[PDB]
């Protein structure tokens, strides 16, 4: 009876998650009405995006084994007075992640309290390197374990950066080897032409990354919902917990 007694709870949570994603789709459809003020739509979509991003991340991690997307945030995202929005549910401070994460290859969306950016992270015994994609459409400034920023010809957008960062993370997964190469370059700090090579590669990476937000969001939601239908009980419990936490 407990195979059933537990199947009821799972079905319940599953229906919660499904109903939520469907509700989000509804809101998005209403916000894209001919009547709607687009600025108002952006403002409204802030909360929608914050709420659905964890679920999108879970789903997309399932659909693309190896993506290993993790939501991360920085110090300013923990300042209640300054941050525009609280970090999404399940978000971890980047420090804690660097210290605790199982070694390997990750994609990330990093929230700094204002904007979210895509990133590729590699944790070795050698150390950890973080490659941050930075939509700019600070010369010779480095930050920190090793971090490198790749300037890309993409409009920096407060309202679009979550979905855009998700998309870019997917593309980084698609260009896994290029980013691995840059990780090795970033690790090989010793080489005399490092500074050049790095910079060179930076440019190149940028290009490969740039080679609508609304449509992408819709598609991601559909994929997420259809995944939630067939999703296993652990995943269901997880997503449900994230959803509950977001409120």
Numbering used by the authors: 146 to 282, 296 to 302, 305 to 371, 449 to 484
Question: What text comes from the article?
Answer:
As non-canonical acetyltransferases, the enzymatic activities of YopJ family effectors are allosterically activated by the eukaryote-specific ligand inositol hexaphosphate (InsP6). Among them, PopP2 produced by the root-infecting bacterium R. solanacearum acetylates a conserved lysine residue in WRKY transcription factors to inhibit the expression of defense-related genes. Our recent studies identified a previously undescribed regulatory domain in the structures of PopP2 and HopZ1a. Both the binding pockets of InsP6 and the acetyl group donor acetyl-coenzyme A (AcCoA) are located on the interface between the regulatory domain and the catalytic core.
The apo-state PopP2 structural model consists of a five-stranded β-sheet sandwiched by αD, αE, and αF from one side and αC from the other side and a helix-bundle formed by the αB and αA from the very N-terminus and αG and αH from the very C-terminus. Structural comparison of the apo-PopP2 structure with that of the InsP6-bound PopP2 reveals that the catalytic core is well conserved, giving a root mean square deviation (RMSD) of 0.5 Å over the Cα atom of 248 aligned residues. Indeed, it is apparent that αF in apo-PopP2 would sterically clash with the first helix of the regulatory domain, which harbors R380 and K383 residues that directly interact with the phosphate groups of InsP6. The C-terminus of αG is too close to the Lβ8’β9’ of the regulatory domain and RRS1WRKY in the overlapped structures, suggesting that the stabilization of the regulatory domain by InsP6 leads to disruption of the C-terminal helical structure of αG to save room for substrate binding.
